[PDB]
């Protein structure tokens, strides 16, 4: 089935997923000359104070860190969001070199990786029902630059050798995703979709402008395997056309 | 979330999202021994598990599965009602909350405490994926589990069940010999059946062994301690993970023995 190589990479997803050539595909290039400041955009409310991580798993496409989403404890409110969106998981996309790896780009600049924290609209009762609505998910995107070691990322780096290959998972409790944020919550936003199959058009994207720094920490990401050898690198979709959409800036 | 065996998503309710559940060749069925007639043209069953190469054991929230390397003809099923070679891809069990229930197939309406299913695909079609989409695609060998003395061959599988307690977990599971899970007698019944779980595709030549294997109360009590749910979700014990018998329709169950 699908993946990122020559055979099943983003080039070839349109074959089994016709929606890949759709109105609201993600990611996109965020052009800062055209992304205009909208003052009616409210400030972003992130409450991860009581987040409850459960496990970390390698699914042959990325690794995911899942959370208890049975209550409003780790939620996203404000910004462009009407209602409350609970945190279900986070994962990264990254590249084989430091000059590539982010899904979103800023003025065509690529970063070394991109952190995606996925949230679903509590309006629809569960994740499954949410994904089949345009306002179903909200993904907070955060760019990863090369620099000093992200102290908050170190716990996650730690545990990557015990989920080296596809199918493996480890218990992963008491993780604080506040530690993965930049200081500034300034963002861009636009009506996007999932960057992997099934590519459903159900995401309000929220991309943070301030990247977080990580150490040349990124070399542990690249040691993970796509297989259960093919190294898990360049697991990003390239930018898609922006079409009739408008990227709006909070700042 | 999706289908299972409870009150809201159990076999009663599978017809809702899987219309084939009310089809021509559903499994399991009650095997009635007064109507299942001995066919002498049925050949003897050839089981070659001498070189089987188990890889891993995983809890998928429905059963646990033990997977094998199926890239060569090393663990195969030939003879019996089968034209061609069927390689072993995995095995799993179905079981119940009590000793008086748990098997999918029944014999003269008798239920057993569990049923072992060794799944094989017809090498004719090149891979598992292509095989399931043909009536002669899979061959599942069914084996009934009675309560009695401890199955020495089952003990290595019992041993590793606490490290895959919940949905999504798996452990490395190498050098397992599935010969140790067989009864002495290979006498069987056979009929054109299908998968007993969704997607319930009608692609199985069923082969059910008549001689059950014995297991200990201690051994089956480890099955029942597994969870349908993942770590963190609320508790639901993995028991009664069997589909009840389905109508036989226009089919004929044939016996290898007098
Ligand atoms: Zn094409
Ligand atoms: Zn996949
Ligand atoms: Zn949940
Ligand atoms: Zn609520
Ligand atoms: Zn992503
Ligand atoms: Zn655990
Ligand atoms: Zn109905
Ligand atoms: Zn009868
Ligand atoms: Zn009779
Ligand atoms: Zn009769
Ligand atoms: Zn399932
Ligand atoms: Zn294989
Ligand atoms: Zn089965
Ligand atoms: Zn291992
Ligand atoms: Zn439940």
Q: List chain A domain ranges.
A: 1-251
Do residues A80 and A56 lie in contact, with contact meaning Cβ atoms separated by under 8 Å? no
Asked if B3 contacts B17 with a C-beta cutoff of 8 angstroms, the reply is yes
**Spatial distance between the Cα atoms of B155 and B153, rounded to a whole number of angstroms:** 6
- The minimal CB distance from B170 to the residues A54, A68, A167 is found for A167
Q: Please tell me which residue of chain B has the smallest CA distance to A169.
A: B169
In this structure, the strands spanning B138-147 and B204-209 are parallel
Peptide bond into B28 cis (omega under 30): yes
Resolution of the structure, angstroms: 2.7
**Experimental approach:** X-ray
B15 catalytic per annotation = no
Q: Under CATH, domain B2-258 is a member of which superfamily?
A: Alpha carbonic anhydrase (3.10.200.10)
Which residues of A are part of the catalytic machinery? 61
Q: Are B121 and B131 in contact (CB under 8 A)?
A: yes
Opening angle at CA A157, ends A50 and A104, nearest 5: 80
Q: How far apart are CA B182 and CA B209, in angstroms?
A: 9
Beta bridge partners of A205: A139, A190
Which CATH fold topology does A1-251 show? Carbonic Anhydrase II (3.10.200)
Mutate to test the interface with B, among A88, A163, A169, A173 (most CBs of B within 10 A): A169
User: Strand, coil or helix: what is A97?
Assistant: coil
Q: Which ligand is nearest to the CA of B33?
A: 8
CA–CA gap between residue B205 and residue B142 (Å, rounded): 11
Check B8, B62, B105, B120 and give the catalytic one.
B62
* Nearest residue in chain A measured CA to CA from B172: A168
Rounded-to-integer distance, Cα A29 and Cα A21, Å: 16
How close is the nearest chain A Cα to the Cα of B233, in Å?
8
Which residues partner with B141 through β-bridges? B118, B207
Name the residue facing B169 among A52, A66, A169 (closest C-beta).
A169
Q: Is the dihedral of CA B249, B254, B255, B258 positive or negative?
A: positive
Q: How many Å lie between the centroid of ligand 10 and the Cα of residue B35? A: 6
> Which segments of A are annotated as binding site for substrate?
195-196
- The answer to whether B230 contacts A55, with C-beta atoms less than 8 Å apart, is yes
CA torsion sign for A209, A153, A128, A54 is: negative
Which candidate, B174, B182, B177, B180, places its Cα nearest to that of B209?
B182
Furthest CA-CA distance within chain A: 50
């Amino acid at each position: 089935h699908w993946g990122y190589g020559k055979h099943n990479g983003p080039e070839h997803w349109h074959k089994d997923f016709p929606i890949a050539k759709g109105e609201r595909q993600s990611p996109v290039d965020i052009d800062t000359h055209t992304a205009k400041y909208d003052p009616s955009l409210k400030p972003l409310s992130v409450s991860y104070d009581q987040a409850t991580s459960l496990r970390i798993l390698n699914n042959g496409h990325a690794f995911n860190v899942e959370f208890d989403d049975s209550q409003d404890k780790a939620v996203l409110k404000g910004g462009p969001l009407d209602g409350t969106y609970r945190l279900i998981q986070f994962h990264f996309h990254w590249g084989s070199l430091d000059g590539q790896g982010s899904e979103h780009t800023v003025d065509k600049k690529k970063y070394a990786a991109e952190l995606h924290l996925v949230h679903w609209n509590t309006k629809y009762g569960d994740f499954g029902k949410a994904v089949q609505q345009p306002d179903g998910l909200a993904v907070l995107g955060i760019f990863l630059k090369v620099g000093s070691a992200k102290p908050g990322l170190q716990k996650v780096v730690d545990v990557l050798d015990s989920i080296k290959t596809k199918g493996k998972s480890a218990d992963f409790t008491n993780f604080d995703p506040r530690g993965l944020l930049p200081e500034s919550l300034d963002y861009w936003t636009y009506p996007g979709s999932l960057t992997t199959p099934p590519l459903l058009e159900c995401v309000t994207w929220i991309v943070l402008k301030e990247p977080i720094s990580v150490s040349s920490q990124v070399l542990k990401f690249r040691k993970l395997n796509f297989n259960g050898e093919e190294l898990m690198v360049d697991n990003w979709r390239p930018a898609q056309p922006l079409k009739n959409r408008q990227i709006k800036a909070s700042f």
